Structure 1
Amino acid sequence: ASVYAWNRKRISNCVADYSVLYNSASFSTFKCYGVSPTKLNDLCFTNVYA
């Protein structure tokens, strides 16, 4: 969708693997600010918003 009409998605109640996206080089920029991108698979929160 457009930049001013950006799509919003809610993710909850499943198992999420971040290694597959972490190792993929098809993305030019992968900037993580909350925590270290390496330790994403260990700690987790109640929900995710995309």
Structure 2
Amino acid sequence: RFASVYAWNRKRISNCVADYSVLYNFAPFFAFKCYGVSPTKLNDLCFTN
């Protein structure tokens, strides 16, 4: 289940290597809009959390 907006959830991601290509395997994304980062170049940047 997904918590409603009146009480939103929040989870951190860190201490792991990430691959967003498998993200395409779940479902087709309706919008998939990236504002500040090029969506194609999400696999060559190292972040904190």
Normalization by structure 1: what TM-score? 0.75
* Cα offset, 1:22, TM superposition: 4.5
| Structure 1 residues 1-50: Cα deviation after superposition (integer angstroms, max 9, x where no partner) | 01121110000000110112247652211010121011111012111xxx
Larger radius of gyration: 2
Q: Percent identity?
A: 91
Query: 1 or 2 for the larger relative contact order (CA 8 Å, sep ≥6)?
Result: 1
Moved over 4 A (4+): 22-25
Q: TM-score, normalised by structure 2?
A: 0.77
Structure 2 residues not aligned, in runs of 5+: none
In structure 2, the CA distance between the partners of 1:23 and 1:36, relative to structure 1 (3 Å rule), is farther
Gaps of 5+ in 1: none
Q: May I ask how many residue pairs the two structures share in their alignment?
A: 47
Q: Determine which structure has the larger strand proportion and give its number.
A: 1
